[PDB]
C-alpha cells in the first residue's frame, strides 16, 4: 500500500519498454528501407514479394 | 485494604503493560514495513498473499 510497492512506477515502466520497442522496430524499418523485414510484419505480402522477386 | 495490597497499582501495571506491547507491535510493523509478520496477525490473508507471491 505505501511503500513495499509502488504500483505507478511498475506500470510507467510497461509504458516505456513498449514505446522504446517501438521506435526500434521504426529504426529498423527506416534502416533497413524494407517495410517487412520478418515474417511476424506481415504473413501475406512476404510470399507475395518473394514470387514478384523471382518474376522480376 | 490499606498496605499490605495496592490493587490501583497493579491496575496501572497491567495497563502499562498492555499499552508497551502494543506499542512494540507497532514497531515491528513499521520497521518491517508488512501488515502481516506472523500469523496471528491474520490467517486469512498470509494464506493470499503467498499464492500471490507465487503467481508473481
Not at 513498449?18 to 524494407?34: H, I, M, Q, R, V
Request: aromatic fraction near 2%; proline fraction near 0%; charge should be positive.
Amino acid at each position: 500500500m505505501r511503500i513495499q510497492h509502488n504500483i505507478a512506477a511498475l506500470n510507467t515502466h510497461r509504458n516505456l519498454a513498449a514505446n522504446n520497442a517501438a521506435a526500434s522496430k521504426n529504426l529498423e524499418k527506416l534502416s533497413s528501407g524494407f517495410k517487412i523485414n520478418r515474417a511476424g510484419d506481415d504473413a501475406a505480402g512476404l510470399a507475395i514479394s518473394e514470387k514478384m522477386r523471382g518474376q522480376i
